[PDB]
Design a protein around this ligand. Structure first.
Ligand SMILES: [Zn+2]
Ligand SMILES: [Zn+2]
Lengths: 151, 151
């Protein structure tokens, strides 16, 4: 329940998907979401670009969604992972993500927090590619993806 | 408080560091930790290797630490990020991380979950490099790193 056993060949990117739910000791719920940009195993986002997307979405997701724990790039680089304090709400996360991506696509200012003081690899960034990935997702159109379990 | 404003030029990798604390509506605490392998801006872990480390630590951290929400690679690729349900406990996370790294360094079996069904980029893995990064951290020696705030 904390991490659904997803069949990666059956999903349709881009999408938002509830990936698991963890209940805290006092009864609160931590919802985990799979924010998929690319189709699994059909290519990956460049390290620089996903790093920049991390910098931009960290802030833009919080402008549109409450209770965000963190937004992290997935090791597979086809999307972002995000934990949110609150009961599952795929529709609300989808709308927040869509709004955050519009902010990212239209981000023509310096990348926030890029320096040796605030960033662990300040030289590895790509705004242009980050913005274009946001645009591609919006062009294709997002949807809530159901979890197809493996056998 | 949910994300301390760290001065990246003052830390000493490798280390474990409480990076922030988020309190849930019912009063539980979600502790966030910075598991730093490399010194900020002195190099990065290859995408394949960090992806494999993600696969291995997801399981090995849970063998040694309760309440783990998720273990994710940082966009800067100098370490891993992890959220844990529970009050701050840097010492306990350090010991868990050390034990998990010994499991990783000694992992000579197939990488878990590597296939088109269970992984979003199954072709991008590097066990050898993953294991060597675990060994390097253990050789250098871990310590709990205090957060030096920026000005
Ligand atoms: Zn950064
Ligand atoms: Zn994977």
């Amino acid at each position: 329940v904390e991490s659904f056993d997803l069949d990666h060949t059956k999903v349709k990117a881009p999408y938002v998907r509830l990936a698991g739910v963890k209940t805290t000791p006092k009864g609160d719920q931590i919802s985990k979401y799979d924010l998929r940009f690319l189709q699994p195993n059909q290519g990956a986002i460049d390290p620089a670009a996903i790093h920049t997307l991390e910098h931009l979405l960290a802030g833009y997701m919080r402008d549109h969604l409450e209770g965000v724990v963190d937004v992290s790039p997935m090791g597979c680089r086809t999307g972002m992972y995000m934990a949110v304090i609150g009961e599952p709400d795929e529709q609300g996360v989808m709308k927040a993500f869509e709004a955050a991506l519009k902010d990212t696509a239209g981000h023509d200012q310096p990348i926030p927090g890029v320096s040796e003081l605030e960033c662990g690899n300040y030289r590895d960034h790509d705004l242009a590619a980050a913005r274009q990935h946001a645009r591609d997702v919006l062009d294709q159109g997002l949807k809530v993806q159901e979890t197809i379990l493996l056998e």
